[PDB]
């Protein structure tokens, strides 16, 4: 399919986004968490993606615990009206999963079971 298509080029866009990410924290360590953090959330939520990748994928930085900061995940979905569901989430050490639906990838889950969640690549 063509989805599956998308969603395997939203990865590789991701793993871009994830290299730009990695420089921002070596290129300035002496930021606080509190200034990474936001730092981070404005790169990734202002990154432009390839033209076609852009009209239907949305992609943003999530952090677990947002005192350890310099561990975020990047979470790609569906933008709205599209009508897809594939997607895509990814750690800041590079592991990276496919997940059959958004909530799946939201949810940074790990495997596949009940008809639902993500596994790696």
Known sequence: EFEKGYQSQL?????????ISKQFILKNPLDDNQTIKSKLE???SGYKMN???????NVSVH???????????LVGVPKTGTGYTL???MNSVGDGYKCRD???ARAHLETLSSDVGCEAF
């Open 42 to 44: 404005r790169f990734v």
């Open 87 to 89: 997607s895509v989430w």
């Open 51 to 57: 033209p076609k990748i852009a009209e239907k994928y």
């Open 63 to 73: 952090f677990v615990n947002k005192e350890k900061p310099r561990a975020y995940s």
């Open 11 to 19: 990865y590789t866009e991701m793993v871009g986004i994830n290299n």
């Open 102 to 104: 958004a909530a799946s």
